[PDB]
A paper describes a structure:
KARRIKIN INSENSITIVE 2 ([name]) is an α/β [name] involved in seed germination and seedling development. The active site is present in a largely hydrophobic pocket of volume 336 Å3, with a classical serine [name] catalytic triad at its base (composed of Ser95-His246-Asp217).
[name] was successfully crystallised from sodium/potassium phosphate in two crystal forms, one orthorhombic, P 21 21 21 (a∼64 Å, b∼66 Å, c∼78 Å) and the other monoclinic, P 21 (a∼50 Å, b∼56 Å, c∼52 Å, β∼116°), each with one protein molecule in the asymmetric unit.
Residue numbers in the entry: 3 to 268
The structure:
Amino acid sequence: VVEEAHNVKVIGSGEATIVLGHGFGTDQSVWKHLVPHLVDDYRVVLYDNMGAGTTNPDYFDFDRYSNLEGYSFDLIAILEDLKIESCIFVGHSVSAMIGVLASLNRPDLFSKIVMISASPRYVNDVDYQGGFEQEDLNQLFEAIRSNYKAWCLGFAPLAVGGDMDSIAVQEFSRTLFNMRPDIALSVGQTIFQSDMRQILPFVTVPCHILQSVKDLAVPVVVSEYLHANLGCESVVEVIPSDGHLPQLSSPDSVIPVILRHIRNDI
């Protein structure tokens, strides 16, 4: 039931397990360039977030997913269903915070978290640069509500970065448009208005903080904030790449960095 609902894939065998969680607007396909490099050394677990366009909209519980905790409960549920005692969790964008939240409730289930395009807060305040002013998010939400198709086409090149006519830009606008308009809007508001800064000192699981040097949703200062405030042992690596989904758009420069962080401990 959980396997089906979240399009769970298990590739490989053995104790050494790796779980990949995707960000907003995409699905497990964001991991296509990474997965080939993991299958020989790990049992690889892929799953889709409830609300992804690949999931049944009838299962999207608005109250359950009003806080990022709903997604954390789902992750723990997938780990328990698969009888996973321990894993390396790689979290892209929102999944990095979902992984961190899951590690608070279940530190036993994670030996390390590798974050990609992570942020605990997108909204700026006079002493915190998250990358977005509330007035701009208000305009972003109204554009999602006004015409979802036109928003997807406009937003995908900006979020992916690089050339506007690339395969990755085309892939992302398709996965964004796969979302049901009302779920996409509700999830967008939930993530963009989230605040995970207060939970950072309480993390015990080692964190590897990776991001593109140019990321529409993640200023470089966010990786330093996470590194300074996470209570766990952490390491930062700012990649010379452009884009929020760099594992998909710039694999040649991003995949080697991710592998180093998965393969080597702090």
